[PDB]
């Protein structure tokens, strides 16, 4: 079971958008230019596999999703991973999939704290995983 992160948890400082995109892009070998591109759910799905290999149905993830309904499919895969791992955060899927900056940036700030609380340092080939 995962370590949960709450608003009352003591965590590292929030990241700038620049540093947050650097973390995503460097860790997953991606080239996101905007935080709202996290609306597809695919990066979160991959980060869950990196934290807990086998927690996510990676073969079902649509890594090249461009339509809101596909984003929803990816987020349902993420939700199933959260449930498997005892993660009690409610993901605001309906909001995130709209692809707006503020909601997407709020969730990723939480997600990065969740990631930092659970990451074991393992090597991970995010390209080979896709």
UniProtKB/Swiss-Prot annotation:
Modified residues (N6-crotonyllysine): 66
Entry's localization field: Cytoplasm, Cytoskeleton; Cytoplasm, Cytoskeleton, Microtubule organizing center, Centrosome; Golgi apparatus; Cytoplasm, Cytoskeleton, Spindle
Modified-residue entries (N-acetylalanine), positions: 2
Domain Calponin-homology (CH): 14-116
Post-translational events: Crotonylated by KAT5 during mitosis, promoting astral microtubule plasticity and dynamic connection between astral microtubules and the cortex during mitotic chromosome segregation, thereby ensuring accurate spindle positioning in mitosis. Decrotonylated by HDAC3.
Modified residue annotations for Phosphotyrosine: 124
Tissue expression per record: Ubiquitously expressed.
Tree of life domain: Eukaryota
Subunit structure: Homodimer. Heterodimer with MAPRE3. Interacts with DCTN1, DCTN2, TERF1 and dynein intermediate chain. Interaction with DIAPH1 and DIAPH2. Interacts (via C-terminal residues 206-211) with APC (via C-terminal residues 2674-2843); the interaction inhibits association with and bundling of F-actin. Interacts with CLASP2, DST, KIF2C and STIM1; probably required for their targeting to the growing microtubule plus ends. Interacts with MTUS2; interaction is direct and probably targets MTUS2 to microtubules.
UniProt free text on domains: Composed of two functionally independent domains. The N-terminal domain forms a hydrophobic cleft involved in microtubule binding and the C-terminal is involved in the formation of mutually exclusive complexes with APC and DCTN1.
Assigned protein family: Belongs to the MAPRE family.
Record function comment: Plus-end tracking protein (+TIP) that binds to the plus-end of microtubules and regulates the dynamics of the microtubule cytoskeleton. Recruits other +TIP proteins to microtubules by binding to a conserved Ser-X-Leu-Pro (SXLP) motif in their polypeptide chains. Promotes cytoplasmic microtubule nucleation and elongation. Involved in mitotic spindle positioning by stabilizing microtubules and promoting dynamic connection between astral microtubules and the cortex during mitotic chromosome segregation.
Name of the molecule in the record: Microtubule-associated protein RP/EB family member 1
Lineage: Eukaryota, Metazoa, Chordata, Craniata, Vertebrata
